[PDB]
Design a protein around this ligand. Structure first.
Ligand SMILES: [Ca+2]
Ligand SMILES: [Ca+2]
Ligand SMILES: [Ca+2]
Ligand SMILES: [Ca+2]
Lengths: 133, 140, 132, 132, 140, 133
């Protein structure tokens, strides 16, 4: 089932990110990956993205929580809560991700999020840094 | 025996075309009595009828366009990658939206639209610029 | 090889008719080009497969293959197809040409005639009122 | 057998294009049924052969075969044909199905689309005025 | 290089349709200056122009129908198996004709029609009967 | 050449009649022959026609002269002068014949002629019987 397959590849990928399983991250990313944080960044190349993420371990941690996930042929859509963690600072924000997978490899990774939501997440992180809650 | 999955996708597509087309009786039929409608971070409304007549009353003041790029389902949940546009006379404001829906028995019980204020602000600036230079107006 | 390509095409067309959409998925290549000649072109096997899957319960298909031959990876068919939308049945001839690579369909090209389809429509509309 | 049937069909279609009417005669079975689907049916190989022979100098034919496969005695073709009447050239797709028995064609069934043919006509008429 | 055989057949067909259609300029172009025209056992006329204007002058008095069942050529000679009809108002007289032609350079130099007085007499009786019982009138 | 073939079969047949070559007549006639003298007679069956003609030798002779002959697919048309000969009486008259040939065999033989022309032929025959010319 090619649908189920695409879904699992995306789930395996996002779990790998969260778990710092960087060999799985490498295996999951297509050579011609385009990776967009929409309105903010674009990177081309699975390998360049894979090594960039690998080089972030120990300075920024990632959490990903997938609330909903569905497929449309080769595309997979996600509704998530993500968090960047830099030492004691935790920045949480919603993310909707769209992916394209081809033969078990991710060829498009496109994350949408809101600067207002992200800003609130930052304020909450910073406040929590002096009131651990 | 056609799966609830195909049904749910189709209900959401029918609903979004109905909004764009101003087909308010289909909008009425599409929305469950206990609808919760969220523009994430901005508004929450409860109740299909209250939302349905709110939308109906916008006719002639603000038009909507919806272009769905990708849509898929997770049981009763439906996810959507779109470009939307709000039109107020000659001003057109275009922005991306990701919507998540829940459908129960052909009726929409959750409608949750996600967007970015930055992207929206950029859409507004382009709308405003196009008011003066009709050539820079966004299109679907 | 030849028989293989023929069987893939038959299996695919029967799966369409039977609404066996996993099999439809498995039959179509990633780089499928799908044409209704003069009318539509779609690229991608996943896209085509999910488009067909999503028609279930709105349009049914029937396919009768009268003749089917092969030349290497190419398979040609002479068929009668029908589209079914509720009580409305529209029947019309189709000649389909396919290319199959490794059990997967990489080209699917259906030819038909608007005049023949128009007549099928009239007959279908008449049949709505005189079920016979 | 299979190759035999394919070669008879190719030889026949090339003979048509080349106006080699004895070969056209030799290719067609006595009990040929010849159909242009939705449009014409003629029975008899001699009748069909002399009808084609008698068009020489009034209508020319061109046939390009893109794909050709066989299933036993049946041969299917995907083609581009053209009818040529003086400076007017009308080009259109044809899918032809044939049956061959003992080197002779016993069925010749051409399928085409009126919309595609209409477009070919417009293009031909336009070309009369803008030769390009 | 299309054979004189196909040409000759076509000239004869064009000529006979021209008679039926009253297309008298094609009739004029079709008939050679030294035409000999025979209804075998009944009439001989010499000269394409004299025959052409004779035929032209029959317009509105006697109509012709021609149905060719078989036609074939022997070099410049063309043979024809037909059913003809002469129409004079409501009277229609139908009979078989075998015609032999010779064509030289697209022009008809010999036109020789064969028929049977008996068959013609039968055609006349049926014509006359059909005048009174319109249902028994011959058709092509 | 199937055209040439049909023509020759008809020529061979009409020559055979004239020459009383009755085995050739037999070979030339199809089992399902229809034989018409138009307006006058119809017979079905190659064999019945072949034997009828065979049974005429010694009482009526036939002459056939083909002026023109042509083909239209399987059909062959003829313009002829024929003559029936009964002892010293010779009856001459024009005949146009149409034939259909299938696989070298004649399946349709249809002769057209005129009773007026035939009557004149009879008078001329009878007159010649007292004035041998
Ligand atoms: Ca972790
Ligand atoms: Ca794949
Ligand atoms: Ca003799
Ligand atoms: Ca034969």
């Amino acid at each position: 089932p090619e649908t189920t397959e695409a879904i699992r590849a995306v789930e395996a990928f996002l779990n790998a990110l969260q778990n710092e399983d960087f060999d799985t991250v490498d295996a999951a990313l297509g050579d011609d990956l385009v990776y967009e944080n929409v309105g903010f960044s674009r990177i081309r190349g699975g390998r360049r993205t894979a090594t960039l993420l690998r080089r972030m371990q120990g300075r920024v941690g990632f959490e990903v929580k997938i609330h909903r996930i569905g497929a449309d042929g080769a595309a997979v859509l996600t509704e998530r809560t993500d968090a960047l963690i830099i030492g004691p600072l935790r920045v949480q924000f919603w993310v909707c991700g769209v992916f394209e997978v081809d033969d078990g490899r991710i060829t498009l990774w496109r994350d949408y999020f809101d600067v207002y939501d992200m800003f609130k997440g930052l304020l909450r992180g910073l406040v929590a840094l002096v009131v651990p809650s």
